[PDB]
Amino acid sequence: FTTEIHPSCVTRQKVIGAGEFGEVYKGMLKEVPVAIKTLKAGYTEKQRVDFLGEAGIMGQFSHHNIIRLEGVISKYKPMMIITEYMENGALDKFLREKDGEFSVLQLVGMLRGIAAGMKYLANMNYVHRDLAARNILVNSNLVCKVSDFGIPIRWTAPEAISYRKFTSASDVWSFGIVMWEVMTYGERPYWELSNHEVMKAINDGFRLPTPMDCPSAIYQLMMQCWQQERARRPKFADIVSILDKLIRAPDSLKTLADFDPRVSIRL
Template sequence: MMPMSGELSLVLTFGTMVCLAILLFFLFRQPGSADPWKINRSAIKLGKRLGEGSFGEVYQGLYNNTPVAVKTLIPGTMDPRDFLKEAQIMKTMQHPNLIQLLAVCTEQPIYIITELMKNGSLLDYLKVRVGRLRLYDQIEMAAQVASGMDYLEMKNYIHRDLAARNVLVGENNVYKVADFGLARVLQATPMLSSQSKLYYIPVGKAIFPLRWTAPEAIANERFTIKCDVWSFGILLYEIMTYGKIPYPDLNNSQVKRMVPNGYRMPCPVDPYCSKDVYKIMLDCWKENKHDRPTFRSLKITLRNVRV
């Protein structure tokens, strides 16, 4: 029995809507549009070069008429697909002491677009302020970093490359941890920049910041949040010495041999470092990772240091 005219009209209308919906889906399903964080290179206007990062160059740029930082990565240092997976997690991390990821461009070289921190890296910031900072200022830097890392620890997330070069300085004495998540997807490559060769060595299929990495991570090529705690102790040494390279009297081979056997850097004397701060370093460098403090306790301890 043929449907009545009204029923036929309803069937046709429903069928037309389904066809239209399918047509619109394929019309607007352009490559890359599934991820709103993934943008075309034309959306970024590069400005002045801010410096050489660990795995590429960093520029000031404009994105949606907003000043941003643009990190360019050396081709071959990571698989864009792996980075995009990691970026999905990084986008969810929001804390006053963590750099905010804004967008990514996966054409080679990869662009990573973040908020702009006008005073650059903590490492450079320290080097030009030798003798001009009070102990209170240095403790505040460390406490803010510990606060950002406490958030990552709460989220069960590991940085893997915590160091003064990966902390950025904004206006009004704001310090933010940067580059969290990148170390997870970096690949060993002979194409390291000249600056990177000062800090990183190939180990197996990965690249490690030897002087900042816990001995068990080097031995097992596996990271835990307690490895980040070890690195925080090294970062605290950098802060107290105004950016001096860790283990200044040892070469890489000596560091690899001596640190797993119990060697620890002595308390900095020139410039002066308080015994309370040095004790925090030693707590971070305990051989048994389970004896190292949490970032929550580090944050509290730093706030209570006598200055």
């Protein structure tokens, strides 16, 4: 079952995005701010199954680091999925607009939240397939929650690219990329390299270099997420455990990995 909301309780205020066959609005629910995704007239059977299926999954999950469902409008048209509203929006854009404004402890806290959400999804037998900072939302407490706005080569594990093997372990690879995104304040993974250049580089053993001002322990962890051999990657359980220990003994984060400068200025 999913909480059914009457349309009279919902007010759409502004368009903030696009759905698969409909739009996404900021609005109010009788009052609390909400995000609202619509499915407009003409939708196919597949679209309806996918839309209500997504809502169903969201309504069963209950975790601090997973987007919360307020409810669904299924009995009237257009159909709607209504979620909590995350005031700071998508993590990738947020970090790029707030470059350098957070402490290392705050950044690592973000990652621990994301990891906790992913551990929950993985153990509930849900494989994300598109984990990236663009699909993480941020609220006014700086809490990060896993979402999905709809192959993204540079986030995807080799086995998922090569033979379509998507698992919690391919999500761990992606999480490594997300760690690099957070610690660089939203740098594009692999910079201007083309998709084929990225795939070639990874196959030949290249990995993203240390971010600036990055704790050694954090760089070590993201490198383990990028083991070629799936079985050698940490589980989300391991990641949550390590990040929790680092945060609870925060002097552990004061030791930095060496940053490899591209340009050296001699004065």
